[PDB]
Amino acid sequence: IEDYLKGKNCLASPNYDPDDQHSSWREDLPQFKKDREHLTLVNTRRNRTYNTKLNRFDP
Amino acid sequence: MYYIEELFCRLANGVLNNTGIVTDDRGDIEDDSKPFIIVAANEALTRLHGRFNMRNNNVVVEMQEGRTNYPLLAKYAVQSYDPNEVKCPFIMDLAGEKFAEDVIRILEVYDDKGRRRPLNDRNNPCSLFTPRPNVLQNNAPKAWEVLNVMYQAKHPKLSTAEDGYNEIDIPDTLDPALDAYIAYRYYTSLNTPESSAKAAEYLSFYDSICREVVEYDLTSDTEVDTNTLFRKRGWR
Amino acid sequence: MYYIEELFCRLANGVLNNTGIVTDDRGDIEDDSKPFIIVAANEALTRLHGRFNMRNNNVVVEMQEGRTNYPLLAKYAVQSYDPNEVKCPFIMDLAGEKFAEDVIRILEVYDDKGRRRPLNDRNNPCSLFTPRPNVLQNNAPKAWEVLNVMYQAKHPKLSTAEDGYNEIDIPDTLDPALDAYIAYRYYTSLNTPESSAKAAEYLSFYDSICREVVEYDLTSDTEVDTNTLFRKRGWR
Amino acid sequence: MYYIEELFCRLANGVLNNTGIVTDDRGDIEDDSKPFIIVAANEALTRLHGRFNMRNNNVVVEMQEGRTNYPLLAKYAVQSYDPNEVKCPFIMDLAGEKFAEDVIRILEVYDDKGRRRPLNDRNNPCSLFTPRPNVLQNNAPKAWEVLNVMYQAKHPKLSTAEDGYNEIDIPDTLDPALDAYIAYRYYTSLNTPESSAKAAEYLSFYDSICREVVEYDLTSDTEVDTNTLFRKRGWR
Amino acid sequence: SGHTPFNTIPPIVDKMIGNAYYVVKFVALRMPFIKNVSDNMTQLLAIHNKLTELSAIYTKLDELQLIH
Amino acid sequence: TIPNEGYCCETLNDPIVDKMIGNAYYVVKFVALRMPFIKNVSDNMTQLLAIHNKLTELSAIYTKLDELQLIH
Amino acid sequence: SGHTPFNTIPPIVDKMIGNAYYVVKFVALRMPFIKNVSDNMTQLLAIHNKLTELSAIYTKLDELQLIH
Amino acid sequence: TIPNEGYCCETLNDPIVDKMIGNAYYVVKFVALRMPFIKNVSDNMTQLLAIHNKLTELSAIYTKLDELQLIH
Amino acid sequence: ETLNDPIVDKMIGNAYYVVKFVALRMPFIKNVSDNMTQLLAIHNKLTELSAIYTKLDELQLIH
């Protein structure tokens, strides 16, 4: 969170991507999603449709 | 000042007691429909904070050379930012609560020198501009210029997820308005003529409560101050 | 700002909660029905940016010898022109900020030397003209003349493709207005008389939200400036 | 600025989603009914270009002795004319787009000498006349007289046939008006009381959008200029 | 409703510039003294670990030095 | 010869600048940025007080410190 | 709302002209120095990889000329 | 004779700066058009510092280039 | 005062930090470009410098 205390915040840096050059007007969000996929229980209120056939008296 | 859990209990034992969205004991809302209430709750709080100037908050912005637009977003704050993406954040919230990204309308801007910077003055050479409501533009960033922005702030977004915001801070006299608006959205979503008539009543009740607050001025919305133009104009 | 997926969730757990185009878990809209929402969403954003002057964006145009009409199209941008049929682009933009033809209405034009250029002044020989709303015409292209055009801009068009835009940047107080218009479009599509009555309610609600924002001026639409005619008229 | 193909996709995924005129996947319109949309589309574009002065175009006419009436038709242009029928065309479009025969109302006429020729002035001996809206009449053709005509131009006619015009160039804020008008014609053609009521709503919506554009002036329809009569009258 | 913090410009214990602010300025002007001690906190803790033993050695002033 | 000052470039444990002592924000920002130094001294104040009480004892040992080495 | 970039004309660290613009103008005047390095970077890079060998030659310069 | 100037034509990263220093847009466009030249030096700044650190080291050996060829 | 900052942001923007990075070390670049031809001369015959470098012991026997 407060990594700003350690410093190393100088704007003068050599890393730069010419393919993503932008002004201060452009603001966009990255493509990263689905960070954690937390554990959860199934919902019994809805009954999911069966998608396969099982032979009766299957061993 | 109560947690989000009490809101579900109050709604279950309140306006939404008769509907089936509550548990068997009418003590809580079903987990399958909790986000539905959250979306309505966030919408309702935004409307109240727009009509009434209940909350006023200020932020500190540090000017950086080479940048003329300073969006008031959470990712540019000194807290809850990505050091890999932005090298140096320019929004300082080192103490107190973190910046919740709740900017609605900019009121006034004061710099570190103690003077007042004119806002959206097209004829003023040294005036700031706002090309977007939540974006502050400076046309001459200096070496050590720091700006403080006073703005009308909405309530922070509520979320039932872990490490989210789960506290409600509104005046208690506006609680019936919150319940009426939430109930209005629920009943109007059923697409039922019987429920549609009920939904209209709740919306009117919500508006009736808000105008009652304005009539008696329970939020101290009005503001007056001693006249200073009398000396400025030299009336003496 | 938020992803279009959050918009899908908000619609799924919002006005469209009782529709057949949502998933069984109410988490997302049906994939085959997604383009229907996208078309409506872009239409709704255009109306909001027209009534409210929320976004003010500027572009840079370079005068080319022998050319008088300068359409503001992406095919003339440096980042999107085709060298096969275009000798050289005259609209300058960046790789990460490609021109998106978001021009709605031209506000002011300034040259590279800092002089304001009058627009549509028929009696002024040096004034510029706009035969079309998105076409800029200069009747005297000079050698090194470069023009900057500041205009009211619409939100960039959303697209489900990965390379296209997938974020929404509008004031959060207008979110109910966005949802109401999308709901109105959906219910109007259904020709059942019951849905027709429901559709009108959302459209009326959408109009009510817009006027409420204007009434309280939550987007800082109103603008004033210091008087300058007093000096120019010579009142002293 | 989009091709005619996107219009069918937008209508299929838009207002006309519910009707059966679209394919099974709601991705396109049936080929058996494509010309029906084209007729409505051409009608809708003419109405918009009449109410709003969006497009202004100019043509060059070369006077020919022995001819006093100069219709502004496509067959008299230097392009797309029959050399066997007309020996010498008098409409020059050597560069740029071909003459599309989109004349609605003549605004002003300037000759090659650089002066302004009065139009429809009955008391002026040297004034031009317009016996028909699309026909320009000159009562004294000279040897090398060339006239330039500035007129309000409608959108070129759209056609799905080969080598036709298949591009739409209208301001994006008028797109909802285009869809509403097309839907109005479709539903009103069914001669069904249920569809007739729906058709009336779309027509009102189309008119509502147009008046909204005028109210906020999104097309820059208004035009003002510096007063020149002050010096002409000798007020000094 | 609400006062902008940066709008600072409009007997014995109280201060004109602000009691809270005066303390902050007092500490700031003497920051290097604090930083010097903070940077050597481990060294001071090591001495403080057996500080009694050094005092006992100190208390024997002449006996420990006459042998040398 | 070109400007290099700025809060981002100054974000490190460096001595204060006398030019902007009168800047109210700068003084507060200076202390707030260096909070851990204050916290490190404060939470172990008891140890320093005992050491401060015995300054003379440590000084005397240092005075004859080199003689003590030869004793070992 | 908004400001056109081109209407430019309406201490020792704040330049009278735009502070960010001064750095850009500083580089533009001295452009040929940078471009001279840029196009000849491969030859310079072919030297940096083995600066140790060149240093070893220098430290024994007196040995170099006595081979005559 | 006839004019020949402009930005779209007769302009490239290879030619040199013109007399139009006063135009603010020209100098900004000048550097922006020649961005890759600046980038090439920037990301390889470490190598330049090492070479510049031994600038006089390579000057002395330059004085006897022909003499070193005799040994080889 | 002149407001030239918006032009830099509009035309360069994110790439301005690279310009500042290089401009901060201009004299280092200046001290190399002026004597560029000396480095090229060394690079011209750079191959035999390694040959001399790998036979140091061969020259020590005379020494």
From TrEMBL, chains B, C, D:
Q: Which domain of life is it from?
A: Viruses
Pfam families documented for this protein? SU10_adaptor
Record protein name field:
30 kDa protein
This protein's species is: Enterobacteria phage N4 (Bacteriophage N4)
Q: What is the lineage of its organism?
A: Viruses, Duplodnaviria, Heunggongvirae, Uroviricota, Caudoviricetes
Automatic annotation (TrEMBL), chains E, G:
Name-wise, this protein is: 60 kDa protein
Q: Which domain of life is it from?
A: Viruses
Included range, full protein? 2 to 80 of 556
